[PDB]
Each structure stands twice: as C-alpha cells, then as structure tokens.
Amino acid sequence: VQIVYKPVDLSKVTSKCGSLGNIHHKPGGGQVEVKSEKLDFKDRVQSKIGSLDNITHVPGGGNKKIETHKLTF
Amino acid sequence: VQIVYKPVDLSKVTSKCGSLGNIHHKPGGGQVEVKSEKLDFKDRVQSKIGSLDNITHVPGGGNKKIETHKLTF
Amino acid sequence: VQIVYKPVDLSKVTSKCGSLGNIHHKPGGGQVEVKSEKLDFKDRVQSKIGSLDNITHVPGGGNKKIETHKLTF
C-alpha cells in the first residue's frame, strides 16, 4: 500500500481599503433603573447591570484562511 | 493499492473598497426600568439588564477561505 | 487499484465597492419597563432586559469560499 498525500496551496485572501473611519458605537446612552424588595434566593445568583461586554472591532484587514488536513489509516 | 491525493489550489478571495465609514451603532438609547417585589427563586438565577454584548464589527476586508482536506484508508 | 485524486481550482471570489457608509443602527430607542410582583420560581431562571447582542457588521469585502475535499477507501 502507498499513499502520496501531496495537496498544493497557492491561494490568496486579500483586501484593499482606501480609508476606514468615522465609526461610532454608543451602547447604553439611556438610563437604567433597578429596584428590588423582599426578593428571596436559595441557589447561586449572577447579575450584570449597565453597559457590559460591548465590542467595537475595526481591523484594517480581518481576513481569515482556515485550512485542515487529515489522514487516517 | 496506490492513492495519489494531489489537489491543487490557485484560488483568490479578494475585496477592494474606496472608503468605509460613517457607521453609527446606538443600542439602548431608551430608558430601562425593572421593579421586583416579593419574588422567590429556589434555584439558580442569571440576570442581564441594560446594554450588553452589542458588537460593532467593521473589517476593511473580512474575507474568509475555509478549506478541509480528508483521507480515510 | 489506483486512485488519482487531482482536482484543480483557479476560481476567484471578488468584490469591488466605491464607498460603503452612512449606516445607522439604533436598537432599543424606545422605553422598556418590567414590573414583577409575587412570582415564584421553583426552577432555574435566565433573564435579559434592555438592548443585548445587537450587531452592526459592515465588512469592506465579506466574501466567503468554503471548500471540502474527501476520500474514503
């Protein structure tokens, strides 16, 4: 038995952008009010209140190549 | 048995953009109000209130190539 | 037995754009109010209130090429 696993990759993933800007992300400009009375809890509580984990992601590229090679015998 | 696994790739994934911008994302500009009275929780509680996990994602390319090669004998 | 697995790819996935912009996303501009009185929860609880998980995705390309090569003997 002979196996010759010989894939050839000459690909490209490319971008050109002339200018990139004037990006505004303003999450949670509005008021938040939370009121609690006579609450009972008897197992774990997780609470997040306000502006949390908001992302502004502005790469000049952001291009991806994902390549997977597998052989099983 | 002979196997010659010889795929060849000269592909391109390409973008050209002249300008990218004037992007406005404003989650949660409105008021949020939560009032809780006499509530009873006998198991785990998770709570999120306000403006959370919002994304502005503005890549100058954002092009993707996904390429899987598999052999099983 | 001989197998010669030799696919050849010279394909292009291409985009050209003059300008990309003036994009406005304003989720949750309206008021949210949540009164809650005498509720019993004998069970796990998850709650989300306000403006969550909103996305403004604005790639200058955003082109995709997905490619799978498979051989089973």
Numbering used by the authors:
A (entry chain C), B (entry chain A), C (entry chain E): 306 to 378
What did the article's authors report about this structure?
The use of sodium chloride instead of magnesium chloride leads to the formation of filaments with ordered cores that are identical to those extracted from the brains of individuals with chronic traumatic encephalopathy (CTE). In the CTE reactions, a greater number of intermediate structures formed than in the PHF reactions. Most intermediates that formed in the CTE reactions comprised two identical protofilaments; some filaments made of either one protofilament or three protofilaments were also present. Most filament types also adopted a J-shaped conformation at earlier time points and, as time progressed, more C-shaped protofilaments appeared. As for the intermediates in the PHF reaction, the 332PGGG335 and 364PGGG367 motifs and possibly a tighter packing in the C-shaped protofilaments appeared to play a central role in the maturation of J-shaped to C-shaped protofilaments. The presence of sodium chloride in the CTE reaction affected the conformation of the β-helix turn in all intermediate amyloids that formed after the FIA and the final CTE structures, which showed a more open β-helix turn than in the Alzheimer fold, together with the presence of an extra density inside the β-helix turn. This extra density was previously interpreted as sodium chloride ion pairs.
Here we use time-resolved cryogenic electron microscopy to study the in vitro assembly of recombinant truncated tau (amino acid residues 297–391) into paired helical filaments of Alzheimer’s disease or into filaments of chronic traumatic encephalopathy. At later time points, the first intermediate amyloid disappears and we observe many different intermediate amyloid filaments, with structures that depend on the reaction conditions.
